[PDB]
Design a protein around this ligand. Sequence first.
Ligand SMILES: CC(C)(CO)[C@@H](O)C(=O)OP(=O)(O)OC[C@H]1O[C@@H](n2cnc3c(N)ncnc32)[C@H](O)[C@@H]1O
Ligand SMILES: CC(C)(CO)[C@@H](O)C(=O)OP(=O)(O)OC[C@H]1O[C@@H](n2cnc3c(N)ncnc32)[C@H](O)[C@@H]1O
Ligand SMILES: [Mn+2]
Lengths: 288, 287
Amino acid sequence: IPAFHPGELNVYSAPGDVADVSRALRLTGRRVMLVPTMGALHEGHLALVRAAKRVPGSVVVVSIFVNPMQFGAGGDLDAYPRTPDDDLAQLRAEGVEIAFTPTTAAMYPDGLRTTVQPGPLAAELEGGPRPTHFAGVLTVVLKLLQIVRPDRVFFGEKDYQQLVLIRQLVADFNLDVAVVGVPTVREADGLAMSSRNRYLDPAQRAAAVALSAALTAAAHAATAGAQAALDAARAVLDAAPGVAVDYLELRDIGLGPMPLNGSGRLLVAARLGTTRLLDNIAIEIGTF
Amino acid sequence: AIPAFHPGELNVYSAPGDVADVSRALRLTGRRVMLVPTMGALHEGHLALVRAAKRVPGSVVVVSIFVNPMQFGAGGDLDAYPRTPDDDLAQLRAEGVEIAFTPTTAAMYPDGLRTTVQPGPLAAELEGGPRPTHFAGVLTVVLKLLQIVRPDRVFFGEKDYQQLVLIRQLVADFNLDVAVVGVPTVREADGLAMSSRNRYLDPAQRAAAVALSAALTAAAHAATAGAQAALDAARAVLDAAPGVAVDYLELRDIGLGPMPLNGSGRLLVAARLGTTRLLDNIAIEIG
Ligand SMILES: CC(C)(CO)[C@@H](O)C(=O)OP(=O)(O)OC[C@H]1O[C@@H](n2cnc3c(N)ncnc32)[C@H](O)[C@@H]1O
Ligand SMILES: CC(C)(CO)[C@@H](O)C(=O)OP(=O)(O)OC[C@H]1O[C@@H](n2cnc3c(N)ncnc32)[C@H](O)[C@@H]1O
Ligand SMILES: [Mn+2]
């Protein structure tokens, strides 16, 4: 077991080290919480941290690893924002005791060999034009779950399709861990917080409010049915300057091979300049 | 309330949740949970794994019996696979095994085939040539069995050497916290590797089948003269047998990577005698 100073931020890069410390903690009775991230932390990520921290007797482990496998190309990987120093200072401020920062070589010493093949959901919505994206996500999350072996792992509703796929992963491989979904943190005007918002200039930032406004408009128009909810969302997006809608779809909450029946999720993806933004919201059809 | 467990007796559980609870409970009481995955129709080969697990101090042995549909081919005969439950549990009782995990297909695959394990490239070679989806089926179910039982050690026979290597790759690549134990092949008196398939051979085929083990052991000793001599010796022995259709005979390093011209390696063979496919392999020291 490597050094572990309670009540302070302990940083480990070696999977073996965090694994030994986690087990040691688990064996003493502490409940290990895992919050997977790719760094460039903002308030959205901190809500996950805070959710993990409120669990009684918990020790919080935050992983920061820009996973190469979920990137479709070298360009996107190199362009991902990285702010190591700010990330650890925010973790320290939140009272997080463990940050796990592995290298690409420690995570993929054998390159891409055994991997996770997601179900059909991975080829839809965000996975449509990025066929290997979710396999990259589930493969790294499975590894992180095995290294850290937390009692609970936290994911944001912001990346709802990712959250649903992780629940499938956990169910399908019989993983003994509870998956905790955390509601989407939004700016004061509704914009969902994202590390990509930094790529919006003043005008785009102002136009980006249309995604959340379109969704919440849809959620209320839904008392009048699916079509009403969809057309209301579309009218808001159409009135937004410089917003190119990629997709806007209403689906059952599980996103699976089931028709929308009552409770669902409205998902949108749109481009502002070169910045692709995403948002989703719970929707009740016919319910007021 | 944790399901009931009676020490010294064979305890059978069909529900994944049940064996998971008993396994975690037993672990806390000071037992090392050993897992031996099988598809039933047990014979001496399987029992060597059981015995290997049983000798671990503080062991509680968990033997899974589950005919995994995912590893059968679009042409593999799932319904034809031998099923002798009563007899299996009897042999386990006789061996002193305390836990048998016998899940249904619905309980192992409640959502059908959704998230699965994709093996690395080795799964497309050797046995993977004729059954390209076989190993994904194997690694998927073994991964699930490891998460349900969470054993300290899991046992596999060297008989299915490629399967053993791929499980070591699964364990390493997904960072699984379990030791993989390979157990030496159990053989009949003349060297034929034990398999339930051997009973399908007629007399002529059964006699010819000895050539697989004979060729490998010949190769192992011819190996002091080099890789080529080992391979030629093996091929000569297989060439002296009638009705033995060799699908492959390959010398690889022990991780099944490229053949070694020196050092340790493994020689693997597969052949068809009529409609029965047989496999064998052996450690080889070249030089
Ligand atoms: C799972 C990972 C770490 C695998 O590499 C990677 O795919 C990844 O998702 O990283 P990352 O983009 O860093 O997001 C990490 C986690 O924070 C959550 N999150 C992001 N913005 C949020 C917001 N505004 N409100 C609430 N939660 C928010 C995400 O849904 C995700 O679970
Ligand atoms: C791992 C499984 C259970 C996944 O479904 C499945 O693929 C499977 O392999 O089942 P099965 O055919 O039942 O074999 C179960 C285990 O017993 C070992 N075994 C069989 N015959 C042997 C022999 N003569 N000597 C030594 N070991 C022998 C196998 O290699 C395997 O590890
Ligand atoms: Mn900064």
